[PDB]
Structure 1
Amino acid sequence: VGSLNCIVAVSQNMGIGKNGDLPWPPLRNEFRYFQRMTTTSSVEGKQNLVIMGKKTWFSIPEKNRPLKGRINLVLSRELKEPPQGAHFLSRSLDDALKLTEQPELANKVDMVWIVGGSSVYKEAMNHPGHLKLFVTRIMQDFESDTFFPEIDLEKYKLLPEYPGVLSDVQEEKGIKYKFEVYEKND
């Protein structure tokens, strides 16, 4: 795997979760952006892979699991087999990426997307080589119990724009937010 993508939405106080759900009310177009970015592949015969922690898996509504049109891989040190509805299970991020080149998946995966939680983001963001971070900045404070790790500008550049990503401030349900893309190459 020559590149990884992370995607996250974060409040001004760096919050990503509260009580097993999001800290803010549902933002429909923001969710549609997460869906569009994690699902879209123009490579015939392949699908994207989403990698997530166990708590993040159980935070997805049951009727929406597995995330449609994507190969769903959960990370856990405890489980014997993937949680019901998931496609694959790995004991670490390293193992997950290695699984993509075994026969079952060799001819099958396009882009890899890391979708949380905190521990999964931290490790991915230090992983060697090319990595993009798609960060939605929710422009308000929200009470939270789960937080996004700091972005090290020694390694990451904020890109001025990005094809297919809106540049202007967005608003839904009276809450302002903006889409950012960060990149590192080494």
Structure 2
Amino acid sequence: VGSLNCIVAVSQNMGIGKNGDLPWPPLRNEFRYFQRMTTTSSVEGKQNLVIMGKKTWFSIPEKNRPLKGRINLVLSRELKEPPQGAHFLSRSLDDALKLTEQPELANKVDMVWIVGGSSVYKEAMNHPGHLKLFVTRIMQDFESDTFFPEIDLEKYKLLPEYPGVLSDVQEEKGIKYKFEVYEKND
């Protein structure tokens, strides 16, 4: 119903996962950023929707599923029902977005947040219309087996600052990182 957004943390070499976990150790303030961004609704009375692929769902600690305070939707072409704990299942991003337009979610959902994995990000990034990418740049190389798609920097523009997002380099566990926001109006 509201805006469509992707949110990701990436290493310099564009890595987002290794062996089903993040490639870096837990960065607690970065996690809190993810939590604040995906949970905070712009409309009182509504929740945000988080959309994620099957492997991403199972990469969330069981104790944290479903992500509290958000509506959790899993994408999968083979699952018959959503994995235990998930609220919805769709076969594709387009089907998920259509679902948000139906009466069951139309008055329940505010923002839509895409939270991975790679194929889901790629699909979202190319989807027509206004889209924002909330990218945490982890300023180190990390061995990774899963990567974020390349961002077309003509098509997307980096916003110089963004309300509610810190601009300075952050550091936790000796790992420096910075929060970035990209936008297309497409």
- Normalising by structure 2, what TM-score? 0.98
Counterpart-to-counterpart distance in 1, 2:13 and 2:37? 25
Identity of aligned residues (%): 100
Q: How big is the shift at 1:153?
A: 1.1
In the alignment, which residue of structure 1 is the partner of 2:74? Answer: 74
Checking the alignment, whether the CA contact within 8 Å between 1:5 and 1:134 is kept in structure 2 is yes
Task: Output one character per residue of 1:107-165: Cα deviation in whole Å (capped at 9) or x when no partner.
Answer: 10000000000000001000101000000000001100000110101200011000000
Checking the alignment, whether the CA contact within 8 Å between 2:2 and 2:109 is kept in structure 1 is no
Q: How big is the shift at 1:2?
A: 6.1
Checking the alignment, whether the CA contact within 8 Å between 1:2 and 1:129 is kept in structure 2 is no
Checking the alignment, whether the CA contact within 8 Å between 2:76 and 2:92 is kept in structure 1 is yes
Counterpart-to-counterpart distance in 2, 1:91 and 1:70? 20
In the alignment, which residue of structure 2 is the partner of 1:143? Answer: 143
Counterpart-to-counterpart distance in 2, 1:54 and 1:13? 24
Checking the alignment, whether the CA contact within 8 Å between 1:5 and 1:133 is kept in structure 2 is yes
Q: How big is the shift at 1:41?
A: 1.1
Counterpart-to-counterpart distance in 1, 2:41 and 2:75? 23
Counterpart-to-counterpart distance in 2, 1:177 and 1:101? 36
Checking the alignment, whether the CA contact within 8 Å between 2:2 and 2:111 is kept in structure 1 is no
Q: How big is the shift at 1:105?
A: 1.1
Distance 1:42 1:4, change over 3 A: closer
Counterpart-to-counterpart distance in 2, 1:46 and 1:125? 25
SS, match of residue 50 in structure 1: strand
Q: How big is the shift at 1:103?
A: 2.0
List alignment gaps of at least 5 residues for structure 2: none
Instruction: Provide the aligned C-alpha RMSD in A.
Output: 0.9
In the alignment, which residue of structure 2 is the partner of 1:29? Answer: 29
Counterpart-to-counterpart distance in 2, 1:168 and 1:44? 30
What is the aligned residue count?
Answer: 186
Counterpart-to-counterpart distance in 1, 2:138 and 2:106? 37
Q: How big is the shift at 1:42?
A: 3.8
Counterpart-to-counterpart distance in 2, 1:103 and 1:42? 20
SS, match of residue 49 in structure 1: strand
After alignment, is 1-10 or 160-169 more displaced?
Answer: 1-10
In the alignment, which residue of structure 2 is the partner of 1:153? Answer: 153
Task: Output one character per residue of 1:36-91: Cα deviation in whole Å (capped at 9) or x when no partner.
Answer: 00000141221000000000000000010000000000000011110000000000
List alignment gaps of at least 5 residues for structure 1: none
Q: How big is the shift at 1:166?
A: 0.2
Show the 5 A alignment for 1:35-184: 35-184=35-184
Counterpart-to-counterpart distance in 2, 1:34 and 1:2? 18
SS, match of residue 101 in structure 2: coil
- Normalising by structure 1, what TM-score? 0.98
Task: Output one character per residue of 1:2-22: Cα deviation in whole Å (capped at 9) or x when no partner.
Answer: 631000000011100000000
Checking the alignment, whether the CA contact within 8 Å between 1:48 and 1:112 is kept in structure 2 is yes
